[PDB]
């Protein structure tokens, strides 16, 4: 629930996901949905991870991804843009960005 965190909801899990792929996923989301942010290239995402760190035998749904921004203002800008845009996509499939 940190001020600089958002949750990325609905990204399918993958057995071959790694840190590089997660960084690329966030950049793909920005480029697919938020062209002014993409052009400016000043989203300073600091850490990106699935939560929790393990996928349990009880879990039924893909884990959220927590994205921690360097700037709280930028977290909030992305959240506001997502909410106003409505449908936000990753390879044409809907995802959600929400507060942590």
Written out in words, the top-level CATH class of the domain with range 1-100 is alpha beta
Question: In a 10 Å sphere around its CB, with 0-12 CB exposed, 13-18 middle and 19+ buried, how is residue 75 labelled?
Answer: buried
Nearest by Cα to 11 from 78, 68, 61, 75: 61
Nearest by Cα to 83 from 2, 3, 6, 4: 6
Whether 29 contacts 8, CB under 8 Å: yes
At 98 the three-state DSSP class reads: strand
By what method was this entry solved? X-ray
Resolution of this structure in Å: 1.4
Question: In a 10 Å sphere around its CB, with 0-12 CB exposed, 13-18 middle and 19+ buried, how is residue 82 labelled?
Answer: buried
Alpha helices in 1-100 (DSSP H): 19-33, 35-40, 72-85
End-to-end Cα separation, the chain, in angstroms: 4
**Axis crossing angle, helix 19-33 with helix 72-85, rounded to the nearest 10:** 50
């Amino acid at each position: 629930g940190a001020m600089g965190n958002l949750r990325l909801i609905g990204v399918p899990e993958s057995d071959v996901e790694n840190g590089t792929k997660l960084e690329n996923t966030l950049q793909d989301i920005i480029q697919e949905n938020f062209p002014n942010l993409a052009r400016q290239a000043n989203v300073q995402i600091q850490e990106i991870q699935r939560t929790p760190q393990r996928y349990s035998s009880r879990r039924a749904t893909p884990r959220h991804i927590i994205v921690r921004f360097t700037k709280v203002e930028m977290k909030e800008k992305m959240l506001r843009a997502a909410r106003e845009k409505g449908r936000v996509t990753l390879k044409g499939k809907p995802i959600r960005l929400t507060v942590d």
